[model samples]
Target: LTPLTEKDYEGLKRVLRSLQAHKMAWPFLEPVDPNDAPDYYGVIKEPMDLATMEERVQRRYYEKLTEFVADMTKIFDNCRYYNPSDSPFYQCAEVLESFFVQKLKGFK
Candidate 1:
């Protein structure tokens, strides 16, 4: 997706901070401010406790996972395909469908 515009930074912050206590540590968070836009970037790794892992693994985790899958499915369905050939993202979608959707289906 295009980089979030200045007008969208605060809105993105709200979404980032909406994570619950158990969400104290999540990857793929790259917050941006219009004034401080980076020229280049690299990934940074961090750590958390076993309790966080436990919280993520517990059945209640289905809530977040389901939300993730639903959000991504909506995006994937709506967005133009990343490339003409089958993209790696579609494979990631397969993983989400088989794992997350199946896990959530068990909840119903």
Candidate 2:
């Protein structure tokens, strides 16, 4: 596989960002990107001759998503801010965690 050209690098970067956006946090709505370019998937207008390029994209995507999950997990892991006796807050946390897990499943 040839070294990634500037176009390939940019295309892959866009793809990775799209992947990250899909795993969004909050009200559990659809992921939206107002300024996103159209048809930024795969290798853009370039050929898929470089299998390693796609592999690199996947590796980076996994790394980024994993890091995000770890960071988010801390929210639930360290819940001292909320009263432990508050059932409503506990339920809310559970719902958020469920949403997070559901989004994480898309990484597969």
The top-ranked prediction according to lDDT is: 2
| Candidate 1 lDDT over residue span 8-105, tens digit each | 44432333233322132222122222243233112212222223433433423423434434443443342213322365544543443344344435
TM-score of predicted model 2?
Answer: 0.37
lDDT of 2 by residue, 1-108 (tens): 344445555555554354334433221122212244233232132222113333555555334444444544544443323325465545555666676566556542
RMSD of each: 14.5, 14.9
Residue 82's lDDT within candidate 1 is 31
User: What are the clash counts of all predictions, listed in order?
Assistant: 0, 0
What's the lDDT for all of these models? 0.34, 0.41
For model 1, what is the alpha-carbon lDDT of residue 54? 38
Candidate 1 off by > 4 Å: 1-72, 78-80, 83-85
Error of 1 at 10 (Å): 27
TM-scores of the candidates are: 0.30, 0.37
